Symmetry: C3
Subunit: 273 residues, 3 copies
Amino acid sequence: MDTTVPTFSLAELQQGLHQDEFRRCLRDKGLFYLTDCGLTDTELKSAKDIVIDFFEHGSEAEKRAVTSPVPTMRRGFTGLETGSYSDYSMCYSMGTADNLFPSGDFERIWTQYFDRQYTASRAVAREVLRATGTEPDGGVEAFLDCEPLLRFRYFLRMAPHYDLSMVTLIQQTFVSLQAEVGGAFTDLPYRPDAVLVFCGAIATLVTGGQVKAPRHHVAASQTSSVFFLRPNADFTFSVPLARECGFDVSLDGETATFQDWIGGNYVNIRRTS
Amino acid sequence: MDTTVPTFSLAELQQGLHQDEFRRCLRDKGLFYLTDCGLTDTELKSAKDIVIDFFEHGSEAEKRAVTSPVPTMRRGFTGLETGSYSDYSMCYSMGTADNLFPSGDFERIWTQYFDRQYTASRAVAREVLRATGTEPDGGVEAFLDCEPLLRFRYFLRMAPHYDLSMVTLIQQTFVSLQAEVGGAFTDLPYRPDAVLVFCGAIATLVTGGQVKAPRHHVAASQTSSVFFLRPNADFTFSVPLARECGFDVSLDGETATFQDWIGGNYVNIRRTS
Amino acid sequence: MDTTVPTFSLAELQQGLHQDEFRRCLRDKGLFYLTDCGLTDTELKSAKDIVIDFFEHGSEAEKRAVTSPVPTMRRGFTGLETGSYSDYSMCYSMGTADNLFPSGDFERIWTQYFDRQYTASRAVAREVLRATGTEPDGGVEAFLDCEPLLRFRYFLRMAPHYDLSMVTLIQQTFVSLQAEVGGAFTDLPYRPDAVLVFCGAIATLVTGGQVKAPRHHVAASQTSSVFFLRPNADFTFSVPLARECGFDVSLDGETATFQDWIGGNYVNIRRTS
Ligand SMILES: CC(C)CC(=O)C(=O)O
Ligand SMILES: CC(C)CC(=O)C(=O)O
Ligand SMILES: CC(C)CC(=O)C(=O)O
Ligand SMILES: [Fe+2]
Ligand SMILES: [Fe+2]
Ligand SMILES: [Fe+2]
């Protein structure tokens, strides 16, 4: 089997092309680059510049006003680890609501950036479901109108793990990002013309094991954008089916919700260790 | 903004003094020293000496008799990490009930030590609620008659994290303890005349985001007393409100309990990493 | 007290012999070697050879076909951590159903290997319950017809922790495995004639604190078989009783289930740190 990370045009997928190839990719690899999805280096420049300017020239008062009282990295500014937790790296997060913006121009640029990412993530997830003939409990659209989280970081840096999202979209700017493909770590360089997609555990779950959730990590001067498309707490699934594809669930009953499985706080990643 | 860790007299707070300053501290820093709360180096000496004597002269049989069958560090003696888990450090824990005491004198000294700590923690938490005009679901006293945990350790030693308590009271004896203040790690030396207070995530939650829960850590021959004031499993709060201040909750419904959020086992700290 | 790890014959236990010694072992140590349980180096050779052959000569296609879409190490092949997650070590897991076998001969050999392990684990757990006069809520057999997990690994390697199983059976092949006995790490060498047993937190819980769940770790060219006997999600227990023996539960009510306590996903180990 080719260990190459494939590339798919969203437009072409939406037209019913390369369905067999798409299915094989999802099953055997669970990751691919996506083009023609409305996201390129162009849309990124604007957001990167404005936020980077903030991480460098924003004062403490300005950062404080956009910092959550709890360091959860859910909304606003965060200094992630004498000195400051910023020494290692800084982060900016946002979602569909309850955001913290430092200025008007920043808000406009990022609200639009977030929207393109959300639209693209929903679109590719929609094709993931169609290619596997998957109809989530409660319908496709209700499943896709969910709880996304966008994190932008600015600098092994990150330990091996898999994501618990439906799908995760990544934009980057030495190749630090590595993913397991064909039983070996493969480089995942930047593609100014595309976004990198990682399938998460929820894709595996909802499709009944038809999609792989690949492990990946970061080796150790770069910025990355990570968009997690996460289901709603009440997303419902079959317990026996989860067991049939690898989930070591401790759930009584025939059906369960995302909340029942993961708990009352979103968990984005999981280390196999 | 001054990055100095302020000091407040409990007596003065209870009299309605420095309310504006207290509010600013809670919001911008989430930590402060507390005086006139009935806890000083005096009350500590007695407890420290008796337990330290145990950690050094107590036999294996004596330690075994006050050691829980599961190494949870909830009650009794614990050797925390050829050799012994004690090599790194030893710990002694207690709560309102189900305690394990090695002797009568030890019991008397520690029951009184625990009580002063619990009274002080409840008292400062009571002022935290009043300063922010917070009325917990079910009332103030029911909220404060909770599930505290006292841990005494004897020796980065501890990774950056924030506490999930309402408030945490610390007594100490090179400044190892560092906390993030104004975007920088600040030393938190010992004050024989006061107790150091850290606001936890529950303070942030119950007050609707009016209190910061500061991150902190320990850099690497000292003993420290840590008292966590923790809510009851049935403490209830508004889901939309939790989201409004940073909590990345995966909870269906308008209201939820501490148990719904954290799970069936108390979790005292959380690393932002 | 002797810090020696005792050995017990399953046959002799089932006949009512050494009951006082067994009780003392469970309470003070929580670990022991077990003989006459139907498991020796003989039964192991067959399974070890066939799987080891796979880890070395099996192609990527063959490994892929027995690899779960999510890297949970619940069923099938797993490469556990330029290179591959296999570099560190490889693993093969199985349970009562939903298994992934690479060949017919492999299936026969391992289905029988798993069965002997499950029978032995249930048998010793049955004696653990009888020696402590324990009658689980819902009866002994319903409690023992549970959710076991068998993991076979092929290479500190593993950090200090205790197991959350009822009991855990280990077969091994320099002594890497160390356990805390009498307040000191003790070697746990291989015994071709016996299986090593570790009591888990569930044994402590169901017996009301009569059984210790010992901490252990691995120091750093060997293979080990680990069989966790895990309760069903609906296993029910008394909340006040759990508190009486060390469990820091955040559970409202008088009774709770394993699922209520641990969550919707099995958790096999826990680090005291
Ligand atoms: C390598 C980056 C995309 C970070 C990542 O994988 C994550 O945040 O889950
Ligand atoms: C620095 C000590 C007070 C330990 C601590 O922060 C904790 O136990 O949460
Ligand atoms: C030392 C081995 C038996 C591994 C282990 O303890 C475990 O998997 O829980
Ligand atoms: Fe990831
Ligand atoms: Fe802390
Ligand atoms: Fe273990």
